[PDB]
């Protein structure tokens, strides 16, 4: 059903739409915290062995 019934908004601009979507999404990003956690995980396993 989803494959047979799909429509864009009649007034769509890709640049405007995706600008308003990325900004809230990237504002609450946690990659920087995740990168620090990865260092500890690799650091820990070498200590165990």
């Amino acid at each position: 059903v989803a494959l047979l019934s799909g429509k864009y908004p009649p007034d769509l601009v890709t640049n405007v739409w995706y600008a308003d979507a990325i900004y809230p999404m990237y504002a609450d990003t946690e990659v920087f915290s995740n990168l620090q956690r990865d260092m500890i995980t690799c650091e820990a396993v070498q200590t165990l062995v």
């Binding site: 429509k7 864009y8 908004p9 009649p10 007034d11 769509l12 601009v13």
Partner: protein
């Protein structure tokens, strides 16, 4: 005749309004525009069917 001024068709036609800015039109935009044209002519000639 009117639709060809905001999109690309297979019929020969001249264009006199291109200095006026316009957006990139999808199928949804064309369908919405055609509805207004249909409504306008129905009112002018007093048609309800």
């Amino acid at each position: 005749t009117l639709v060809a001024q905001i999109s690309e068709t297979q019929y020969p036609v001249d264009r006199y309004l291109d200095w006026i800015p316009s957006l990139r039109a999808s199928a949804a935009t064309a369908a919405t525009f055609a509805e207004w044209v249909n409504t306008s002519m129905k009112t002018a000639f007093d048609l309800s069917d």
